[PDB]
Design a protein around this ligand. Structure first.
Ligand SMILES: CC(=O)c1sc(CCOP(=O)(O)OP(=O)(O)O)c(C)[n+]1Cc1cnc(C)nc1N
Ligand SMILES: CC(=O)c1sc(CCOP(=O)(O)OP(=O)(O)O)c(C)[n+]1Cc1cnc(C)nc1N
Ligand code: SF4
Ligand code: SF4
Ligand code: SF4
Ligand SMILES: [Ca+2]
Ligand SMILES: [Mg+2]
Ligand SMILES: [Mg+2]
Lengths: 1231, 116, 235, 58, 118
């Protein structure tokens, strides 16, 4: 049977993938992660596939691991699938050649996502799927949510019957995350279409010792080519099979498909060939334009591989004079993109009519592809006919872009109601919108579509919802640009974003604000908005959601109130109908705290419906005085690039605005000043003991310690209260803790940590602090940071250093950022950072916000993100370059010493040479060299002078999360540490893959609840530290800021100074862990993590062994017995206790036992009498030698694999026995 | 399963060209590298004897369990457990929650008491 | 000047790759292993490149690791190269998009070898190089032992001046292992062809805490497409 | 009357340079590819050459 | 019926033994990340590593299993880093069976290991 359902592309495909598969090897990667997670939930829920079994799902260490497991499962006779995209799909390519080469019925469901080149992008385009087009996989694209379901089914059925693996793909986000009301088939229906004969044949030919065969042989030139071509028959039949199944599925759904489907005028003269979600938008435009007489059409490509020309021409109108092939990718240097190339080849082989073929590029990284852009494409075919063009951008550098007239008429089906919602992160807007879609879809015959745009900012972020409802199918695969209804759920937006852009005349605008009176409205509402409201005769509604919520007792939560506004004013449904449906849904959900909470919510709906009246605005608004523009100083670069981007105007930025290589400048976050904290700390001078711990712990560098001389405070604001500096080294200085209220995120860690019983820091509402502290911060920022007064690596002194990572987009109270911020305070001016992809790369470098910055001398962290899987190797290469280049420099310095260079120069050169690897000496002599050689441009001295940026010893650091270190990048990390070279690896262990949605990693602990570990992880946390300590020559240490800031600083100093590889693992709290009392308790949680024995602190230092001392040092004490409270204070453990108390109780018991054993093992190590020696080098010497030189017997085989330029000499190949056996035989043969 | 180094390492090494060739080409480095190898194995064997003499056993846990059912790590959490990013967005996400921009539970409670 | 010698494609190319590089991240795979081994032996022997320095060569855990290291070395201002083929080249693909995307003068020398599908083969064909055709690397083919030397040189010189990474390839075995009497150039001659200003600028734009920048940002739909097209002038 | 066009620079593929080496008298051209991309309408070099001719429009 | 389905699955009746074969290059270097993950899974699989202390097939290149001082390609003056201790690293898990064998020393211990490991 059939069934109506409002879901997204991911779930529509997962629904089918689950039914048709027995095994699934998974790995998380946006935006495909949802499919794997769904499959896991359903399997846990008891959902059965077409064989009546729960799916066997396993999470691997990487997509390469997943692909290998998928190959194994298929080879072993189990129907298998996987979900992936972008970087992940790339890692699967090697196994794809094997899976197709061995004709296995595997199916890959991919959310087409951009590949990281000049920058990383999680958004949609076909760069990934095109990279795997030569792997031998059949490729079937779906252009909508409904199609994702249908094509997913066809793919599985076809793979099984054809023995050719399929890659079913749909556009990342645009289709994967778009919600639509669709129809899905029952699992029984899918089962009935399976070719039982083929399925049995699949089982029978699979690997099995009962009837074995060998697969994966190595072949010579004599037979490889023939073997490669032996699969030809199978590929020739796949198109017919696909066509067959489209038809069989159609007879059950009523929705027909062909390899290529044509839409538009039967006599169209201008035709577009496209693939993916673009086809929906293009058809929409065709419907509109064709109705006006336009002779245009579209050919939708369903089966991209194999590419069947006959099917292409069957969909091609003989009247077509011009044809444009749209490719959603970019292949640099190629004469044309993939689809365009395939189409050109079709016409050449046809050898007949040759219409004009144009190539166009679009939608990279989910770039909008709107009706206006489609109009440009069709106009281009009747006009200039520009070839190899781009649409959606302004290419003012090479001039490849098509102009786009955005005044193009709305093309949505008649009657379609379009809505937009502007929300603040965590205010429940998205949830309310989803509920609305579910409700309307389930109680009307209207089609429903939803799409959400989020923010790169993790906390206090902006969200914009785009909803559409109509009597006709919704093919609008682009954002809403002309809304009938617009709602702003955050009054702060009114003064920063273009909220009413494109709203239809007579449209409705609802605003959440406490500006009920006209005077207040006129005071806060900008003229530009006034209107627009007046001019477009908009139905303006203002509702004090916060007040009503508080009144009914919902504690200011506005979701239910803004929801009511939608149902009452959107015009999608009738009053009474909308109301009861809404109330019914309220009674549906909740019902937890009895009718207590239900009441309520129902009351809020009632109180909202009444307070929802039109705002009577004057006609004078039509000419509200054009506001000025109070703008502060800034770079841009900030003004021309980041500001526009932050204001949602990035799309208008031309190509000329960016660096060809994608680089961005450091410090752009300095001017963001978001001010999204609800509460910020207030300094209480009288209680302060001037310890600097608050600044040390801040996750956003929002606390600025100030140490100034009496002179520096002359023009200081009246309220710039300062205290006499404590400490003998700080006599006549004045101390002040300056709160940066606008950069503060309101987490509360500082205040929670402030030592004095009578807090020197107290959380207060932002509005009570900004007026006074904004000007103070600005004045403080201009005060020189006293970096040369206290030890740089001391707790207090470290905070008197310039932090080189500030105001990042990390969550409030993030447990990763405090560690990195302080690291920059110690080595920032000379460090390189190779950052693995993950949260640290996201809060670290999400354009256009760059938190890393330079110091007053322009020095700062050289930061880079290569990939997720290669951070260690990436840093290693940086290390290699420095070794090579600084060795070159040293060689030149040695040469210079043997010349007529001045005595001073020779002195400096000798000084640098002797301390080249010492940060202090290399800088000392390097700086002397910079002055002595200033202006030198000729000869040897000239070369040396040009290498000044290589003078002081640099610090190469590798930053990464636990997912990277323990899983995907482990092999690379292990190799880099084993190299023995000078690199520093800093692992921020959040015990889960945080950025991607909290998936389990091998760093996840026993009993913790995480994705793919939803019943509590059943394997213990991998002991990465003890594994690396087995090398003996690698510095290894664990830290936990909340336990000891001193130990952490000590570890940094020791690790960085170690003339070898260093590994430091830090306990990083994270929102995913669910700290019950708030992230503001992170430091406390870090403190208990150690005291409980959950996270023991220790250091393994190889140089101690070199001096007859034990390299292993324990820094924490035996478990204090508080693990139970530690665990239960985190939702990742507590949730298990609420849903499965028995298993939970047992799992927490296991963790307590595991840590008891491990600590005893650590003590064991602490009392060892076995110290492994250590030596940086000592040897080498010029020259090389081959392992075979002078060998008594052959040391290489007769294979082409061992052949070398110098091989071929005669040798004893061991076919006559041992030297003694041959000697004894010689003696026995006499003669 | 084997015994302490019997002193024949030297081999042992010199009976294989991969080691012997170095002795013929770089005599000084070779003898030092062979001595290093002999030291490495001496220390490692002692560490293995160390493991063989310990009384700290790790309670081996077979497997099983499974427990028909699963729960999301965010269910019932006091504060938001997911961010406002497109990367963490899921079909069931979107409900309102405390995003940690107002301070700890106690800090908020205290402020409430101070504001009244 | 010119120098006569009878050698195979691998050596003819290695001859050039060594002179033109400062760093090399390697992993063994037939039929390209010879090039890496020669580079390492020559470096151990003290052979100097055009800069009068011995090559800094390191063996990684896989070609994925090698590509990652190459990317890091180039990002940090060192002329870098590697040698690979088939399965190895496949593992470098992800980093290849990064290297070209970041406009780094990297140079890959590959002995074109078949990809393992229905079976594995260490023999020559263009299945591997065609697999990386969309990565943005320039691709220069040499059709003989003599051409391997000449094209290798052109690839290095062109990568330095253009800032677009090059993949110089020749047929596995048929060219890589075929021996011919050819002519090679002295290192001094190759050095005279290098664009010093392009080289200096490469160093200048590279990663360094003395004058840092951020690379490898994450970008939303608002600017990604524009950023991807910004390299057109270079290509 | 037979000829051969040797491809040195495969990427970027410059059509201008390709035609500069193509004899005007060429009636039939065969593009040899040393690979196999199952299901493709043709192999890499063939597809590039085909695009060159279609774009020339002659 | 059911009996028919069961009958057709006879090649699944007896417990099979899953083995992963590989050299030191695979286990200590390139395939290490995957091996580590598979062992950590706790599933019933058997990994047999034939350690030749070098990438043999390709021409004797050094691997992380190559010992201090051994000459090999990319170790032209004798490897200057010790052999990676794969065995002790995996033993850190506690729930993985780990053993080392050497036929020439004891065929008996080797057979005991196979039986116990499997
Ligand atoms: C943005 C991107 O594509 C990220 S963010 C990252 C999460 C890493 O977790 P870790 O514990 O290492 O760090 P954390 O976030 O601090 O917890 C993943 C899995 N990836 C997706 C992914 C998957 N597979 C591959 C090859 N590349 C990528 N980029
Ligand atoms: C035939 C093939 O392509 C060989 S044989 C194998 C040697 C393995 O050494 P190990 O120590 O693991 O085993 P041993 O030979 O028994 O010593 C290599 C390096 N490869 C080349 C290679 C390199 N890198 C990648 C991704 N794939 C392959 N196939
Ligand atoms: S509340 Fe949090 S973000 Fe704000 S200053 Fe304190 S530690 Fe920093
Ligand atoms: S933590 Fe408290 S006592 Fe310490 S410097 Fe900060 S405000 Fe003062
Ligand atoms: S590590 Fe956790 S708390 Fe920090 S930014 Fe990532 S999701 Fe947020
Ligand atoms: Ca170090
Ligand atoms: Mg993590
Ligand atoms: Mg081996």
């Amino acid at each position: 049977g059939k069934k109506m359902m409002t879901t997204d592309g991911n779930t529509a495909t997962a629904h089918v993938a689950y039914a048709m598969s027995e095994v699934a090897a998974i790995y998380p990667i946006t935006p495909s992660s949802t499919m794997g997670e769904e499959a896991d939930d359903w399997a846990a829920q008891g959902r059965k596939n077409i064989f009546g079994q729960t799916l066997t799902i396993r999470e691997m260490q990487s997509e390469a691991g997943a692909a290998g497991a998928v190959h194994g499962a298929l080879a072993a006779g189990a129907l298998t699938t996987t979900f992936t995209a972008s970087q992940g799909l790339l890692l699967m390519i090697p196994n794809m050649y094997k899976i197709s080469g061995e004709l296995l019925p595997g199916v890959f469901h991919v959310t087409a996502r951009a590949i990281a080149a000049h920058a990383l992008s999680i958004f949609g385009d076909h760069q990934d799927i095109y990279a795997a087009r030569q792997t031998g996989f059949a490729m079937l694209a779906s252009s909508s949510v409904q199609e994702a379901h249908d094509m997913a089914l066809v793919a599985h059925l076809a793979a099984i019957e054809s023995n050719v693996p399929f890659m079913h793909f749909f556009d990342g986000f645009r289709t994967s995350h778009e919600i639509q009301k669709i129809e899905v088939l029952d699992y029984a229906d899918m089962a009935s279409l399976v070719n039982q004969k083929a399925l049995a044949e699949f089982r029978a030919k699979s690997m099995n010792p009962e009837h074995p065969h060998v697969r994966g042989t190595a072949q010579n030139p004599d037979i490889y080519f023939q073997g490669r071509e032996a699969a030809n028959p199978y590929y020739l039949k796949v198109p017919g099979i696909v066509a067959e199944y489209m038809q069989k599925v159609a007879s059950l759904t009523g929705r027909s498909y062909k390899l290529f489907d044509y839409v538009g005028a039967p006599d169209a003269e201008r035709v577009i060939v496209s693939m993916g979600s673009s086809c929906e938008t293009i058809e929409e435009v065709i419907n509109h334009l064709a109705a006006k007489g336009e002779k245009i059409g579209l050919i939708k490509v369903r089966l991209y591989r194999p590419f069947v020309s006959e099917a292409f021409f069957a969909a091609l109108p003989a009247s077509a004079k011009v044809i444009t092939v749209l490719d959603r990718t970019k292949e640099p240097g190629a004469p044309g993109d993939p689809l365009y190339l395939d189409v050109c080849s079709a016409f050449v082989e046809r050898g007949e009519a040759m219409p004009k073929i144009l190539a166009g590029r679009y939608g990279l990284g989910s770039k909008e592809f709107s009706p206006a852009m489609v109009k440009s494409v069709y106009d281009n075919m009747s006009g200039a006919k520009k070839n190899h063009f781009t649409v959606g951008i302004e290419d003012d550098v090479t001039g490849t872009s098509l102009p786009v007239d955005n005044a193009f008429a709305d093309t949505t089906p008649k009657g379609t109601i379009q809505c937009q919602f502007w929300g603040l992160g965590a205010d429940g807007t998205v949830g309310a919108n989803k509920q609305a879609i579910k409700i309307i879809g389930d109680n009307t015959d209207l089609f429903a579509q939803g799409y959400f745009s989020y923010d790169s900012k993790k906390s206090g972020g902006i969200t914009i919802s785009h909803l559409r409802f109509g009597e006709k199918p919704i093919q609008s695969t682009y954002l809403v640009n002309r809304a009938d209804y617009v709602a702003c759920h955050n009054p702060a937006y009114v003064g920063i974003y273009d909220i009413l852009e494109g709203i239809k005349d007579g449209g409705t605008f609802v605003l959440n604000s406490p500006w009920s009176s006209l005077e207040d409205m006129d005071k806060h509402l900008p003229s530009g908005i006034k209107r627009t409201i007046a001019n477009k005769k908009l139905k303006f509604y203002n509702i004090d959601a916060v007040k009503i919520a508080t009144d009914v007792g919902l504690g200011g939560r506005i979701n239910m109130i803004m929801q009511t506004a939608f149902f009452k004013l959107a015009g999608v449904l009738p009053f009474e109908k909308a109301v009861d449906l809404l109330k019914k849904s309220i009674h549906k959900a909740y019902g937890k705290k009895g009718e207590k909470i239900v009441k309520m919510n129902t009351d809020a709906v009632d109180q909202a419906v009444t307070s929802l009246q039109e705002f009577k605005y004057p006609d004078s608004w039509k000419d509200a005085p054009a506001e000025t523009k109070a703008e502060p100083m800034t770079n841009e670069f900030f003004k021309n690039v980041v500001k526009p981007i932050l204001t949602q105007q990035g799309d208008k930025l031309p190509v000329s605005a960016f660096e060809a290589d994608g680089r961005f400048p450091l410090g752009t976050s300095q001017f963001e000043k978001r001010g999204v904290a609800i509460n910020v700390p207030q300094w209480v001078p009288e209680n302060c003991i001037q310890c600097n711990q608050c600044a040390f712990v801040c996750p956003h560098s929002a606390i600025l310690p100030v140490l100034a001389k009496e002179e520096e405070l002359v023009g200081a604001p009246a309220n710039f209260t300062a205290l006499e500096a404590k400490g003998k080294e700080l006599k006549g200085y004045k101390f002040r803790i300056q709160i940066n209220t606008l950069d503060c995120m309101g987490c509360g860690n500082c205040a929670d940590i402030c030592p004095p019983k009578e807090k020197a820091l107290v959380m207060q509402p932002l509005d009570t602090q900004r007026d006074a502290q904004v000007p103070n911060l600005e004045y403080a920022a201009r005060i020189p940071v006293k970096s040369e007064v206290l030890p740089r690596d001391s707790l207090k002194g470290s905070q008197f250093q310039e932090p080189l990572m500030e105001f990042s987009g990390a969550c409030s109270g993030c447990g990763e950022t405090p560690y990195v911020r302080v690291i920059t305070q110690l080595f920032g001016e000379r460090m390189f950072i190779a950052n693995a992809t993950g949260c640290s790369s996201i809060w670290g470098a999400s354009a256009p916000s760059m938190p890393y910055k330079t110091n007053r001398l322009g020095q700062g962290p050289a930061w880079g993100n290569s990939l997720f899987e290669d951070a260690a190797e990436y840093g290693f290469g940086m290390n290699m370059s420095m070794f090579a280049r600084r060795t070159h420099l040293a060689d030149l310095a040695a040469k210079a010493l043997e010349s007529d260079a001045s005595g001073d120069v020779k002195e400096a050169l000798q000084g640098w040479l002797a301390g080249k690897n010492d940060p202090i000496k290399s800088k000392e002599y390097g700086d002397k060299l910079k002055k002595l050689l200033a202006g030198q441009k000729d000869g040897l001295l000239g070369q040396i002078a040009a290498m000044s940026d290589l003078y002081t010893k640099k610090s190469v650091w590798i930053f990464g999360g636990d997912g990277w270190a323990y899983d995907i990048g482990y092999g690379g990390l292990d190799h880099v540490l084993a190299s023995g070279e000078d690199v520093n690896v800093f692992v921020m262990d959040t015990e889960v893959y945080s950025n991607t949605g909290g998936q389990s990693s091998k760093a996840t602990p026993t009993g913790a609840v995480a994705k793919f570990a939803a019943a509590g992880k059943r394997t213990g946390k991998k002991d990465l530290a003890r594994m690396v300590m087995t090398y003996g020559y690698v510095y290894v240490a664990t830290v936990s800021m909340g336990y000891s800031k001193q130990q952490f600083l000590k570890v940094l100093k020791e690790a960085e100074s170690f003339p070898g590889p260093s590994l430091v693992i830090a306990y990083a709290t994270c929102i995913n862990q669910g700290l019950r009392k708030g992230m503001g308790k992170s430091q406390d949680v870090m403190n208990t993590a150690v005291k409980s024995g959950y996270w023991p602190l220790f250091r393994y230092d190889p140089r101690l062994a070199a001096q007859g001392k034990n390299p292993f040092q324990l820094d924490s004490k035996a478990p204090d017995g508080s693990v139970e409270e530690f665990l239960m204070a985190q939702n990742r453990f507590a949730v298990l206790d609420r849903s499965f108390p028995e298993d939970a109780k047992r799992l927490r018991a296991q963790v307590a036992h595991e840590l008891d054993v491990r600590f005893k093992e650590l003590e064991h190590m602490a009392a060892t009498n076995i110290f492994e020696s250590f030596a940086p080098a000592g040897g080498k010497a010029d020259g090389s030698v081959d392992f075979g030189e002078g060998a008594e017997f052959c040391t290489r085989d007769d294979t082409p694999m061992m052949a070398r330029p110098d091989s071929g000499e005669a040798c004893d190949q061991n076919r006559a026995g041992t030297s003694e056996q041959q000697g004894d035989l010689s003696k026995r043969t006499k003669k």
